[PDB]
Design a protein around this ligand. Structure first.
Ligand SMILES: CC(=O)SC[C@@H](CCCc1ccccc1)P(=O)(O)O
Ligand SMILES: [Cl-]
Ligand SMILES: [Zn+2]
Length: 230
């Protein structure tokens, strides 16, 4: 039932209902000669929607907006990018053109600029230090410390017990650390431990790519990371 990479042509986007008022979005994109799936989140915010992460590229993010309008029919009014790479901010210009207010931490914005990526407009205050959390509409944003990248954020939806890990959390079947160019391998397991301590009651955990699962994804991710340091 959760859609997989072979099922989603590049340029198409799927929505998957996780709970009342909470969806993931799934899209696909080419990276270094292969196509990969990628997850974001959508959360009902009263009469509006909160989007977590783009659908990895302008074309995909436009298909995401059209899919939302077709299937849900509420406006996306705000979007948060959880780190600075193109699967998370690629498409921000499309969001902004569509009337969406785009957000990221000051760190994410700076890194996106240096990288030549699209830059979310607004800075999120209060996420400077490992362990910092802030409320943002119907979610909590948490900076666990450096992991997949130095700036990566995770997102918790307390009304549904949904934890979105972005690229700091791997799916259960993934045994190989993927893109780790900007990762901090020594800090990653500590950052996971912070997530674990802060969200011990999470029921659904969404990795940045692939199948959702449970809190077992956190331990699994640490295992893969520790294995790729030995
Ligand atoms: C592992 C990630 O989430 S990194 C973001 C890259 C996507 C990498 C996706 C991926 C997933 C599993 C294995 C290899 C690559 P980019 O934005 O630079 O294209
Ligand atoms: Cl990138
Ligand atoms: Zn990344």
């Amino acid at each position: 039932e959760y859609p997989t990479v072979s099922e989603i042509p590049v340029g198409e986007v799927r929505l998957y209902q996780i709970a009342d008022g909470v969806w993931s979005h799934i899209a696909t994109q080419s990276f270094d000669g292969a196509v990969y799936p990628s997850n974001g989140l959508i959360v009902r915010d009263g009469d509006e929607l909160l989007l977590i992460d783009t659908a990895w590229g302008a074309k995909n993010t436009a298909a995401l907006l059209a899919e939302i309008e077709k299937q849900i029919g509420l406006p996306v009014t705000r979007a948060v990018s959880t780190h600075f790479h193109d699967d998370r901010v690629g498409g921000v210009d499309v969001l902004r053109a569509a009337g969406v207010a785009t957000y990221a931490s000051p760190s994410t914005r700076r890194l996106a600029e240096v990288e030549g990526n699209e830059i979310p407009t607004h800075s999120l205050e209060g996420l400077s230090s490992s362990g910092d959390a802030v409320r943002f509409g119907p979610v909590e944003l948490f900076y666990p410390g450096a992991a997949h990248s130095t700036d990566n954020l995770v997102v918790y939806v307390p009304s549904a017990s949904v934890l979105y890990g972005g690229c700091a959390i791997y799916e259960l079947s993934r045994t190989s650390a993927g893109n780790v160019a900007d990762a901090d391998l020594a800090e990653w397991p500590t950052s996971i431990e912070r997530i674990q301590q802060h969200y011990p009651e999470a029921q659904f955990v969404i990795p940045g790519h692939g199948l959702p699962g449970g809190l077992d994804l956190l331990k699994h991710t640490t295992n893969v990371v520790k294995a790729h340091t030995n």
